[PDB]
């Protein structure tokens, strides 16, 4: 039941220290690949960060966050969220695997966009969310947990340089066997978010 995984899925921030096999990662990515996308453009690209390169990753992250703390960053209206970003770095350090998700069709966050450009971003970004959600749900099916991460935006330039990518950085997802079982997070009810016409 996908309904079962949809209901049971949680953001997991404590993991078992146990390695995840390449094959398990393969299965999760191949669920992402099966997402729908605008014009079947499939704009998602993935960079799997293993133990090999984790420390270097985390250093780039931390440099970006420090740059933000120093007021040389990109999110001056979100200083209250820097503490959360530092917590996410810790979670990424402990998680056995983190996968970066890129948008090969993405334009820089630093550039100003026409309405048409915005619509392409919106379409592609939604599509990538479908992929990452597929990955998340597949992790649940496999007995893993995951955490979807946009705190990487506090080190946007630094991580794009680290990745040496010409693509737009969208997110990371950390994965592993879970070491917590959170109850359902708060949600607005269907009456709060739906208008029937």
Ligand X SMILES: Cc1cc2nc3c(=O)[nH]c(=O)nc-3n(C[C@H](O)[C@H](O)[C@H](O)COP(=O)(O)O)c2cc1C
- The footprint of Cl ion (CB under 5 A) covers 39
Confirm whether residue 9 is marked as ligand binding. Answer: yes
157 near 72, Cβ under 8 Å? no
178-181, long-range: CB < 8 A, 24+ apart: 178/12, 178/14, 178/15, 178/16, 178/144, 178/145, 179/14, 179/15, 179/16, 180/12, 180/13, 180/14, 180/145, 181/10
Apex CA 84: angle with CA 172 and CA 138, to 5°? 35
Does position 52 interact with ligand X (CB under 6 A)? The reply is no
- Site size toward a copy of itself (CB under 8 A) is 79
Q: Which of 63, 86, 121, 179 binds a copy of itself (CB under 8 A)?
A: 121
Q: Which stretch binds ligand X (CB under 6 A): 7-15, 24-32, 102-110, 113-121?
A: 7-15
What's the closest the beta carbon of residue 38 comes to Cl ion, in angstroms?
5
Q: Which does 121 bind (CB under 5 to 8 A by kind): a copy of itself, Cl ion, ligand X, none?
A: a copy of itself
C-alpha closest to that of 173 among 103, 99, 102: 99
Binding site: residue ranges? 9, 11, 13, 37, 88, 150-151, 185, 187
Q: Give the residues lining the site for ligand X (CB under 6 A).
A: 10-11, 13, 36-40, 88, 123, 126-127, 130, 147-151, 171, 182, 185
């Amino acid at each position: 039941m996908i309904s079962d995984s949809i209901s049971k899925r949680r953001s997991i921030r404590k993991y078992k220290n146990q390695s995840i096999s390449h094959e398990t990662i393969e299965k999760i990515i191949e669920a992402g690949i099966n997402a729908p996308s605008s014009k079947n453009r499939q704009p998602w690209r993935f960079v799997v960060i293993t133990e090999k390169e984790k420390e270097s990753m985390l250093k780039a992250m931390s440099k970006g966050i420090q740059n933000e703390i120093n007021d040389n960053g990109l999110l001056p209206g979100s200083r209250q969220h820097i503490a959360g970003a530092n917590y996410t770095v810790e979670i990424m350090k402990q998680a056995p695997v983190t996968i970066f998700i890129l948008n090969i069709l993405g334009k820089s966050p630093l550039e100003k966009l026409s309405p048409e450009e915005r619509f392409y971003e919106m379409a592609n970004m939604q599509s990538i969310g479908a992929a990452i959600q597929n990955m998340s749900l597949t992790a649940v099916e496999l007995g893993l947990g995951s955490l979807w991460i946009c705190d990487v935006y506090f080190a946007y330039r630094e991580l794009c340089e680290w990745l040496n990518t010409d693509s737009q950085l969208v997110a990371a997802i950390s994965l592993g066997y879970p070491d917590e079982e959170p109850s359902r997070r708060p949600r607005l009810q269907l009456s709060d978010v739906t208008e029937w016409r």
